[PDB]
A paper describes a structure:
We report the cryo-electron microscopy structure, at near-atomic resolution, of the double-stranded RNA Rosellinia necatrix quadrivirus 1 (RnQV1); this virus infects the fungus Rosellinia necatrix, a pathogenic ascomycete to a wide range of plants. At difference most dsRNA viruses, whose capsid is made of protein homodimers, RnQV1 is based on a single-shelled lattice built of 60 P2-P4 heterodimers. Despite a lack of sequence similarity, P2 and P4 have a similar α-helical domain, a structural signature shared with the dsRNA virus lineage. In addition to organizing the viral genome and replicative machinery, P2 and P4 have acquired new functions by inserting complex domains in preferential insertion sites.
Here we report the three-dimensional (3D) cryo-EM structure of the RnQV1 W1118 capsid at 3.7 Å resolution. The ~470 Å-diameter T = 1 capsid shows 12 outwardly protruding decamers at the pentameric positions (orange), each bearing five copies of P2 and P4. Our near-atomic models for P2 and P4 had 972 and 1005 residues, respectively, of the total 1356 (P2) and 1059 (P4) amino acids. P2 lacks 383 residues in the C-terminal region, predicted to have a high helical content, and P4 lacks 54 C-terminal residues. The structure of P2 (built from 29 α-helices and 20 β-strands) and P4 (29 α-helices, 9 β-strands) was organized similarly and was divided into two domains, a shell (S) and a protruding (P) domain (right). P2 and P4 overlapped considerably at the S domain. Both had a long α-helix tangential to the capsid surface, the α16 helix in P2 (36 Å long, 24 residues) and α15 in P4 (50 Å, 33 residues), a common characteristic of the dsRNA virus lineage CP (right, arrows). Analyses with Fatcat, Cath and Dali servers showed that this P2 domain has structural similarity, in addition to ferredoxin, to gelsolin and profilin, two actin-binding proteins with a variety of actin regulatory functions. The P4 Val648-His805 domain (in insertion site 2) has a surface cavity in which the last visible P2 C-terminal residue, Gly973, contacts P4 Ile791. In addition to the numerous weak interactions in the buried intra- and interdimeric surfaces that stabilize the capsid, there are five molecular hooks formed by short loops or α-helices that extend further on the rough contact surfaces, and contribute to pentamer stability (labeled I-V).
Residue numbers in the entry:
A (entry chain A): 2 to 973
B (entry chain B): 1 to 1005
């Protein structure tokens, strides 16, 4: 400051700071930026959900926030077109084919640990606009003098007192010396509480007993305490080895360090794996108000999905009464395999509204002075209530975080009062009455700033939308834990201060069901996140293998590769308020997002901008890894018997079923001993069994007792209860990994035809056909090997069967200059373009034909459940050969309309085998002789009739022999 | 989208203390609302003689273009939605040789809607001319004119649904404004300003919300074409058009339904598995439906329309009610007659069980366009009994087109290709086969309220305000002709594609397995349609709207067969094309004395007239040249013969059979439950050819717990409260059960019943199972019944997988059926109304099928026309090739005119006239020598009486449309072509202010 005394400019800089700070203070009260104009009223959320690269991709703007029947399908189509030269049917012509492969994406609550750390801070980076005016920008001078002209004392006489005890209470918990906790000014803590609660009661789809049994409630209908709302959990279920995918990666990794909430959420999920369960009733109970070392869990799983759980109590009236019933949230399993979690309005909260009105707040309680929330007493209550326990709240996801944030603010039982509603209200909270008045009014009114809001909006959007693709043959991705912070609920300006009644553009009530905000929050996580899965699919290890170092294991081999991971560079971080510190293992998502859609990077879409600026870091080690919960470990079609990694990939089987993307690529049970790095290809997997303390006769686990023992598939389990088996497989070249599809549809190139040579990964002309051959043999259905001379580590023979796509052409492990493709089973059978796989194998070898791909892929929203028919139209092997050049022949060539002869096309690329006796061999002694002609017999009997109208009868008949008796000679 | 709307970003600043004007009144967007009318109303009066200029059956109408500023305003708001760029417009351009044929068939074509199949023929009197020469002096024998009519029956395809339209909302100022109405209600005002009259308030806003489902906006272009399909379907039903009936009565009265294959006093032939199940149904009097043959021996079933499509709805289902995710379309206001028609189209949903045409009636409902007449947009419902007859039924189409497609005139024509693609040529000759085709359906993804748009824009009256006029009918009957003209182009093209596969692709029989024979023919088509689009990347543009796979459309087949520019048939963006379904399921005849077919030696050398006379005097179905029990007979080795494959073992027909005894547990429970229905349901009508996989997949789905299969079992009395699970029904394997096996009465005597009840698809429907679940399960049941009928009769229960079923396997390869040959004969005659057109030249001594100097046609049509002519005279012309085969043209071993395919060079040797009215046409005298036979044709279109027609057009009604409306202004003033339209407000900025209240925070003093 002394120096700036002495700079020619120095005195101006000083006059100016002082002068601006002095005028800005005088009238804090008329300060807001929400109401400036129609977009930046209602927080600049008009247009976020669909960027323009993405509109092109075709996702509709209904927004992907689960509604009763919503599925998102990413399906790419390609249309390969082979120009066949020495056909086996008459000598030229080309043969277009067309197919489509469909991904599945899920969106829902993301389970990986939430690292939210909540600390009151005192700063004006977010806070509120009234607060912003209130403290001068740079010159530190007491302001209460000025502030008082503008705020009655009862608020500020009282608030400060709230700020004193609240400080003491936190000093209670961390035993911090209390100099070092600070009174809050930050409002990301609030923006988050009211925002989280809204993007839960509006996003979710609610089951009202409108009558008789459960029903849906229309976009416009009351939510009674008794509304099951189920939130789609970014999970998938099935049959075959992976019962659920994808689990949190880390639940699986050998030492967990999990919290209380996950331990009763992961066990809940695992019981959900048995091939016959439907909705695991997790009830939590019995939690005392000193502390929580005593809460009984119980699991009752009823084996149908819709008998989801129920409680006898309307909204609890004071938390201690709310406590007794205890908090129970069921989990149920889907249609379309989206594991849906269901919960009840009574649960999220307990009834704050203890309205006390318009007099100086009493010695100890919080009061919210709400101006002109008329009859929204119920919508308000839901927004601002200590969660049912009001203490340690055991909801599985964000709610648990929201409850924790609420709990930082007040001890169990600080009774909150509402003023400006008459003495009571009902809880009905019909929705807009929720978002019209309730979340929008609530934040605009308190002058709470865009910046607090984009942060809450993106953070929620981040822990309600982690979208991970559905590959069930292998896992998905292990959606990584995100590190974020937020200050508690009390807020200087929001909590005890007056409600600021003036609007600027769009008016609080005229905001409908907040589709803009709600879709906007939901979309942002999915689009940004999708690249990360998509990015993972797109890029992998160059040589197809992942190094393993000695005793290893997959979690551990996971962090060693990280040392060699590569990511794009962030750029222009103006928006994040110096919360910009790294670990070099945390790259914000929007590191990836730039990679895929490169186009987002110049700052023209909030979706990229909003995301990178204030978007939780995540963590990036475990992201390669996949975890899924499998039925048993050690009898899996593909345990590649450890040794192949030892000697080398003598064989690899990729076998792609009739319809889906998926490849059940092979893995090497991956704690396998040795003295040096041996390069694995292509997947390293690890099976683990965890056993958890047993239930009392009914359903007891005490939360603390819950202790998990890692053991492996070679350690004995008769002792230790088990619940599920964890398998995590890490992989390099994403072939037949559901993502590959995710990578293609979204990053991948589209709508320009490019020949096999350009697509293929091989180098010389010669070994570019061999790959193009290897796949085209694999479409029809007859396995095809590409065999390599043993040197290098590539795995001696790679064979694939089944319906492969061309971009998949791209990912097949090299092939150069040693190796020719050999067909494993040559049995010739009817097929679709060909028959007798070998003639094909010769066909490729001659440069007879080339196949040029073009494909266009669209991301889609499917809202109504649809049925599809896959027809493989397929020619015979008996009579594929025969049909001998119909067109050189000069009789056919002459009964066919001319172009036909002219155009290039053909039904088949290569002819088959094995025709049965070859002519109409009927032993003579079967040809009767036509009897001699009768000359004079009139022909009205045989000459064809001519058109007359009507229809008349057929007389035929039979008798039905008793069916039962023949059913007796059996079928069929 | 990339940018927030321009209207939303703009600010009041710069401001000043003196900026009095209210917010609403600046930041108001620039709109100049009235938009000039753009098109011309009337056909034009001739200037001289004052006689109205005529274009047939035609109504042309005027439509609002919108002012430049106003579309810009609509745009700032719709930042983030995708509306298809315009579909291209192209006439169909054909090759030169085919150009002349397509023009002629097109010129007049008049269907004659007899018993469930479209009818056309050109009556033709032709003078056979025999040309031969003596040393350079010509000779001619033309004794008499044959009078014969070529009839081309067009029977509808078998439809099934898979592919659902992608969500792009077809582009209209009805669609653009719907998109705003959805975005404004949902995402609160301030994603748009109040966008309609009546959307201002709230309690207007709430009533619009509760109805209109969330993803719910404009796809008329797709919902229109499926409506067109079903009314055209309903036009075959209640054909007379003097029919007057109640809707229940219409459902109950039994018209013939158009089943697969021809049937003759002593044989049936070439009928699909569905047809063979229904043949037993007719034969054994167990079902209520009787199989009957229309003239020429064609095939038909006599069920009630209710019975085919509509069975399995419990009494919850009627009238496409609100918030069921269905389409819910707006009815214009008209006499109950028309309102009752729209109600009856999508009566309690009727799923696709195919009678040949039952399909068409079904199609509207499955895609979910389900008109509503209740509820505030569309007029008061019309009483149970309002008798819509074919006149009010046509009105509905007429209006459907005027208000769908916004008078765009690409989409409306584009519909015709899809409607034309649904119709085959029929099968008449007694072993047709050669029919491996089914139109696969799309169901629209996007559901939006029909009356929501109309109620929200009605300023005065509370009802949907589109008004029917007597001009919609002129459009209806005009469109009926446009369909009637385009169908001849489609049906011709399809035949050519079939010929292309038949001649050239390799088709062969092993063990006389017909389906496997047919399946190959389907594959070739499937590859002769994919090449038509003509690039890899243009297909993706043509796809954009549809998200079934790229299954190529059925008329793409016609585009290949036909001259082949693929833009005209389904455009680069063509909402709702139907792709190809594998409907090839069999041939399968049967006889009066169940028997196989005798094979007749004919020995080739020494053509004698008397052996050929005897053959003509033989019967039409049963003679078959080669017996293929053991051998694979390709048409290169065996041209032109029927290969009669003998009765069908258990073994062929495995991928079809639905009773088997291999089931593991708690699928044993499900399958026993299915069998018990099958054995009991008197009166079931079959057409769904359920395979072994359909029941496999159904029982797998039914066993595993999903909420749907779970609720089903709790409904139907299995598995919740079941104590007799284990033993009661898991060891009950049929061939236990007592008493009657086809009657619902279960004694209290009976021992061994599965469960002591029978559920019909009303209770199962009244315990709430999707109409899809109950239908498919109920469909399986009916199929198992269917199949029970065949097993009983069959040589055995297929205990052995070579056990002989009662019917046949006989395929006529190297032969075109009567339907295909009549199709060529009809088209061939239209080009030869005047000219001679010598047909067969040098009948002996070169190929029959030849192309030379002047043709005007390929050369199938030349010999095809010749066949149909020799049919109606009395001729049996045998074409015998050196090698080993011999087949006739005119009359045949099949019966009636059937030209033989030339994979082997055919040469004529002798003609045999059945009966002698000694005034023959010189042909026998030209085969001794070798000469050319010129055929001077005179044809007369098969024009029926008014009370059986596809389209009646009103030639006089051009008096109405001609004049061009206009409002000539007297007393000067200025009225340009400008009418008012909608307008919208836009966002604007409103600055709000709460009524001041004092609590005890605020400063006051």
């Amino acid at each position: 400051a002394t120096q700036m005394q002495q700079r020619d400019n120095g005195e101006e800089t000083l006059a100016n700071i002082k002068h601006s700070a002095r005028s800005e203070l005088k009238d804090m009260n008329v300060s807001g930026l929400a109401g400036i104009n129609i977009q930046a009223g209602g927080y600049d959320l008009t247009g976020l959900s669909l960027t323009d690269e993405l509109i092109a991709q075709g996702l509709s703007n209904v927004g992907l926030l689960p509604f009763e029947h919503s599925r998102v399908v990413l399906e790419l189509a390609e249309a390969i077109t082979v120009t066949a030269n020495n056909t086996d049917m008459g000598g030229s012509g080309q043969y277009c084919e067309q197919g489509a492969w469909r991904a599945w994406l899920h969106v829902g609550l993301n389970m990986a640990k939430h690292h939210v750390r909540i600390r009151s801070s005192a700063a004006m980076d977010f806070g509120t606009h009234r607060m912003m005016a209130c403290d001068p920008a740079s010159l530190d001078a007491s302001t209460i003098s000025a502030m008082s002209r503008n705020v009655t004392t009862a608020t500020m006489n009282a608030v400060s007192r709230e700020m004193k005890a609240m400080k003491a209470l936190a000093a209670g918990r961390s035993r911090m010396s209390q100099s070092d906790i600070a009174d809050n000014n930050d409002c990301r803590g609030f923006a988050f509480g009211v925002l989280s609660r809204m993007v839960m009661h509006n996003s979710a789809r609610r089951h009202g007993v409108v009558n008789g049994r459960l029903q849906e409630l229309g976009e416009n209908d009351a939510s009674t305490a008794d509304t099951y709302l189920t939130w789609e959990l970014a999970c998938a279920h099935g049959k075959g080895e992976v019962a659920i995918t994808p689990v949190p990666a880390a639940w699986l990794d050998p030492e967990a360090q999990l919290t209380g909430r996950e331990r009763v959420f992961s066990e809940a999920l695992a019981r959900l794996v048995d091939p016959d369960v439907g909705c695991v009733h997790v009830k939590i109970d019995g939690v005392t108000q000193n502390a929580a070392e005593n809460a009984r869990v119980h699991y009752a799983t009823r084996p149908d999905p819709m008998s989801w759980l129920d409680d006898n109590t309307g909204l609890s009236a004071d938390s201690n009464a709310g406590r007794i019933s205890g908090e129970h949230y069921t989990l149920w399993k889907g249609r379309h395999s989206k594991v849906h979690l269901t919960i009840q309005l009574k649960q999220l909260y307990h009834r704050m509204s203890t309205t006390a009105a318009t007099a100086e707040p009493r010695a100890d309680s919080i009061v919210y002075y709400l101006k002109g929330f008329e009859g929204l007493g119920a919508c308000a209550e839901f927004l601002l209530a200590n969660s049912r326990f009001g203490h340690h709240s055991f909801l599985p996801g964000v709610f648990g975080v929201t409850a924790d944030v609420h709990e930082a603010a007040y001890a169990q039982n600080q009774a909150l009062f509402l003023a400006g509603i008459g003495d009571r209200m009902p809880p009905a909270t019909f929705t807009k009455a929720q978002l019209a008045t309730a979340t929008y009014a609530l934040m605009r009114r308190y002058d709470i700033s865009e910046r607090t809001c984009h942060f809450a909006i993106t953070t929620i959007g981040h822990m309600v939308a982690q979208t991970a693709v559905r590959d069930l043959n292998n896992g998905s991705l292990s959606p990584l834990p995100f590190r974020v912070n937020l200050s508690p609920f009390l807020v200087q300006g929001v909590q005890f201060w007056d409600m600021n009644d003036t609007e600027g553009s769009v008016s609080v009530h005229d905001m409908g069901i907040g589709k803009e905000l709600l879709t906007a929050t939901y979309a942002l996580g999915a689009m940004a996140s999708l690249a990360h899965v998509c990015e993972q699919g797109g890029t992998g290890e160059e040589m197809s293998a992942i190094e393993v170092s000695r005793f290893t294991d997959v979690h551990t081999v996971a962090t060693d590769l990280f040392r060699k991971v590569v990511m794009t560079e962030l750029g222009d971080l103006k928006l994040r308020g110096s919360e910009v510190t790294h670990s070099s293992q945390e790259a914000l998502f929007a590191q990836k997002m730039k990679a895929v859609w490169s186009s987002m990077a110049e700052g023209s879409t909030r979706l990229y901008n909003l995301n990178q600026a204030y978007g939780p870091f995540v963590d990036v080690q475990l992201a390669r890894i996949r975890s899924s919960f499998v039925r048993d470990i050690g009898a899996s079609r593909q345990m590649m018997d450890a040794s192949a990694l030892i000697k080398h990939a003598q064989n690899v089987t990729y076998d792609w079923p009739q319809n889906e993307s998926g490849c059940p690529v092979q893995f090497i049970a991956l704690p396998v001993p040795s003295t040096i790095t041996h390069y694995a290809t292509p997947a390293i997997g690890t099976e683990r069994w965890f056993a958890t303390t047993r239930l009392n006769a009914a359903g007891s686990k005490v939360i603390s007792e819950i202790r998990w023992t890692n053991g492996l598939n070679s350690d004995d389990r008769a002792g230790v209860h088990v619940f599920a088996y964890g398998r995590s497989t890490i992989v390099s070249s994403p072939l037949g990994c559901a993502e590959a599809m995710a990578a293609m549809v979204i990053a991948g190139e589209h709508k320009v035809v490019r020949r096999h040579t350009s697509i293929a990964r091989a180098q010389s002309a010669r070994t570019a056909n061999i790959v193009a051959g290897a796949v085209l043999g694999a479409r029809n259905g007859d396995m095809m090997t590409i065999i390599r001379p043993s040197t290098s580590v590539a795995s001696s023979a790679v064979h694939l069967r089944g319906y492969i796509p061309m971009a998949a052409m791209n990912m097949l492990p090299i092939t150069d200059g040693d190796c020719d493709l050999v067909v494993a089973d040559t049995r010739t059978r009817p097929g679709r373009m060909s028959t007798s796989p070998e003639a094909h194998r010769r066909g490729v070898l001659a440069s007879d034909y080339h196949v040029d791909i073009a494909t266009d892929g669209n991301i889609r929203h499917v809202a109504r459940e649809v049925y599809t028919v896959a027809d493989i139209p397929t020619v015979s092997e008996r009579v594929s050969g025969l049909a001998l050049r119909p067109y050189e022949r000069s009789c056919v060539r002459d009964a066919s309309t001319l172009h036909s002869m002219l155009c290039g096309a053909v039904p088949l690329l290569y002819g088959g085998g094995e025709p049965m006796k070859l002519g109409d061999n009927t032993p003579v002694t079967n040809r009767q002789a036509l009897r001699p002609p009768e000359y004079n017999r009139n022909p009205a009997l045989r000459m064809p009739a001519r058109f007359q109208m009507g229809t008349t009868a057929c007389a035929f008949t039979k008798a039905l022999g008793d069916v039962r008796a023949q059913m007796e000679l059996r079928e069929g | 989208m990339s940018a927030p709307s321009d209207q939303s970003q703009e600010t009041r600043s710069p401001t000043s203390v003196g900026n009095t004007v209210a917010a609403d009144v600046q930041t108001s967007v620039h709109d100049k609302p009235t938009g000039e009318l753009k098109g011309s109303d009337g056909t034009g009066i001739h200037e001289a003689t004052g006689l109205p200029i005529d274009k047939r059956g035609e109504v042309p109408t005027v439509q609002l273009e919108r002012t430049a500023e106003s579309i810009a305003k609509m745009m700032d708001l719709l930042r983030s939605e995708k509306f298809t760029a315009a579909a291209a417009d192209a006439k169909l351009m054909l090759q030169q040789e085919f150009q002349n044929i397509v023009a002629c068939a097109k010129n007049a074509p008049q269907m004659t809607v007899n018993a469930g199949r479209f009818y056309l023929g050109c009556n033709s009197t032709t003078a056979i001319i025999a040309g031969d020469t003596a040393d350079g002096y010509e000779i001619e024998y033309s004794g008499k004119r044959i009078e014969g009519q070529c009839v081309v029956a067009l029977e509808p395809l078998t439809i099934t649904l898979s592919g659902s339209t992608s969500s792009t909302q077809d582009n209209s100022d009805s669609a653009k404004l719907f998109a705003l109405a959805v975005s404004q209600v949902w995402g609160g005002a301030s994603t748009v300003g109040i966008v309609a009259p009546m959307l201002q308030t709230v309690a207007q806003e709430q009533t619009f919300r509760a109805r209109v489902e969330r993803d719910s906006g404009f796809q008329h272009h797709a919902a229109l074409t499926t409506v067109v399909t079903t009314i055209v379907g309903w036009l075959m039903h209640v054909g007379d058009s003097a029919a007057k009936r109640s809707r229940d009565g219409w459902l109950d009265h039994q018209t013939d339904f158009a089943v697969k294959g021809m049937l003759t006093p002593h044989i049936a032939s070439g009928m699909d598995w569905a047809g063979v199940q229904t043949y037993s149904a007719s034969a054994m009097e167990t079902t209520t439906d009787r199989v009957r043959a229309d003239y020429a021996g064609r095939m038909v079933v006599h069920s009630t329309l209710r019975k085919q499509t509509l069975r399995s709805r419990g009494t919850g289902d009627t009238t496409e009610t609100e918030n069921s995710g269905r389409y819910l379309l707006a009815l214009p206001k008209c006499d109950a007659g028309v309102a009752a028609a729209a109600l009856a189209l999508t009566w309690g949903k009727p799923k696709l069980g195919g009678a040949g045409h039952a399909n068409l009636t079904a199609v509207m409902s499955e895609a979910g366009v389900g008109y509503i007449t209740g509820v505030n947009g569309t007029r008061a419902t019309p009483h149970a009994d309002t008798v819509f007859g074919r006149e009010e039924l046509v009105y509905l189409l007429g209006f459907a087109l005027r208000h769908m497609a916004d008078a765009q005139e690409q989409v409306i024509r584009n519909v015709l290709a899809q409607v034309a693609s649904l119709f085959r040529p029929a099968a008449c000759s007694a072993h047709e086969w050669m029919n491996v085709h089914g139109a696969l359906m799309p169901k629209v993804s996007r559901p939006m309220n029909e009356p929501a748009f109309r109620e929200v824009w009605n300023v005065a009256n509370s009802s949907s305000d589109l008004q029917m006029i007597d001009r919609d009918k002129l459009n209806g009957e005009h469109f009926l002709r446009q369909l009637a003209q385009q169908i001849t182009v489609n049906c011709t093209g399809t035949a050519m594609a079939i010929y292309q596969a038949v001649l050239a692709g390799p088709t062969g029989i092993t063990d006389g397995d017909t389906t496997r024979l047919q399946k190959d023919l389907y594959h070739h088509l499937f590859q002769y349609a994919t090449t038509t689009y003509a690039d890899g990347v243009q297909v993706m543009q043509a796809n954009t709207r549809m998200a079934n796979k790229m299954v190529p459309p059925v008329n793409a087949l016609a585009a290949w067969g036909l001259g082949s520019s693929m833009d005209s048939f389904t455009g680069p963006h063509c909402a709702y094309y139907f792709g190809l379904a594998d409907a090839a399921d069999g041939c399968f005849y049967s006889t009066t004395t169940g028997r196989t077919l005798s094979v007749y030696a004919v020995d080739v050398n020494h053509t004698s007239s008397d052996s050929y006379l005897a053959m003509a005097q033989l019967e039409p179905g049963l003679i078959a040249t080669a017996t293929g029990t053991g051998s694979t007979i390709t048409t290169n080795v065996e041209a032109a013969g029927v290969v009669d494959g003998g009765l069908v073992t258990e073994g062929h027909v495995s991928l079809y059979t639905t009773i088997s005894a291999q089931w593991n547990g708690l699928q044993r429970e499900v399958y026993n439950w299915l069998l018990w229905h099958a054995c009991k349901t008197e009166d079931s009508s079959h057409a769904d050819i359920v395979g072994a996989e359909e029941v496999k997949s159904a029982v797998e789905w039914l066993s595993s717990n999903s909420v749907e299969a779970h609720r089903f079992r709790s409904s139907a009395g299995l598995g919740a409260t079941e104590a007799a699970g284990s033993p009661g029904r898991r060891a009950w394997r049929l061939h236990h059960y007592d008493g009657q096996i086809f009657s619902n009465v279960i004694a209290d005597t009976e021992r061994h019943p599965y469960m002591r009840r029978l559920y019909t698809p009303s209770e199962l429907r009244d315990a709430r199972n999707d109409l899809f679940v109950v239908d498919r399960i109920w469909k399986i049941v009916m199929a198992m019944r269917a199949q029970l009928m065949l097993i009983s009769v069959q040589e055995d229960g297929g205990r052995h997988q070579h056990s002989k079923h009662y019917f046949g396997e006989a395929a006529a390869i190297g032969v075109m059926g009567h339907g295909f040959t009549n199709l060529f004969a009809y088209c061939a005659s239209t080009v030869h109304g005047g000219r001679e057109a010598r047909l067969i030249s040098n009948c002996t001594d070169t190929p029959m099928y030849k192309k030379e100097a002047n043709d005007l046609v390929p050369p199938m049509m030349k010999v095809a026309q010749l066949s149909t002519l020799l049919a109606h005279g009395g001729a049996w012309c045998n074409a015998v090739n050196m090698g080993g085969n011999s087949t006739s043209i005119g009359l045949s071993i099949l019966g009636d005119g059937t030209m033989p395919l030339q994979t082997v060079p055919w040469t004529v040797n002798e003609i045999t006239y059945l009966s002698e009215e000694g005034a023959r046409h010189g042909i026998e005298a030209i085969i001794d020598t070798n000469g050319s036979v010129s055929v001077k044709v005179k044809m007369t279109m098969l024009e029926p009486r008014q009370r059986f027609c596809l389209y009646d057009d009103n030639k006089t009604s051009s008096y109405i449309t001609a004049q061009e409306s206009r409002t000539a202004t007297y007393v000067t003033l200025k009225l340009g072509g400008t009418k008012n339209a909608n307008t919208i407000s836009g966002l604007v900025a409103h600055d709000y202010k709460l009524a001041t209240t004092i609590l005890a925070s605020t400063y006051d003093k």
